[PDB]
Amino acid sequence: GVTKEIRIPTLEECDVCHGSGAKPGTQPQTCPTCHGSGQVQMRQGFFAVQQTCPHCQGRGTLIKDPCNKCHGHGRVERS
Numbered sequence: 001g002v003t004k005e006i007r008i009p010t011l012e013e014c015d016v017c018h019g020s021g022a023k024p025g026t027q028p029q030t031c032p033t034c035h036g037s038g039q040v041q042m043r044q045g046f047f048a049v050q051q052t053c054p055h056c057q058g059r060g061t062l063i064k065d066p067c068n069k070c071h072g073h074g075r076v077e078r079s
């Protein structure tokens with residue numbers, strides 16, 4: 001019983017979305033804003049420094065299509 005019902009919480013990557021968050025096969029959409037590099041270049045003329053892209057929370061990837069299994073998060077508690 002307890003042998004199968006392994007009631008000892010642990011996190012697992014959603015293998016189905018390969019731990020990302022986008023539906024299987026349907027990979028996360030490369031954030032164009034930061035050219036998939038996770039950082040936007042604040043090209044205010046000379047001072048062309050960068051900022052973390054908020055749109056994709058610096059991950060450079062947009063969960064356009066959320067992996068239902070993990071509600072687009074990308075990882076879940078073993079269950």
Ligand SMILES: [Zn+2]
Nearest residue numbers: 014017067070
């Ligand atoms: Zn998933």
Ligand SMILES: [Zn+2]
Nearest residue numbers: 031034053056
């Ligand atoms: Zn981005």
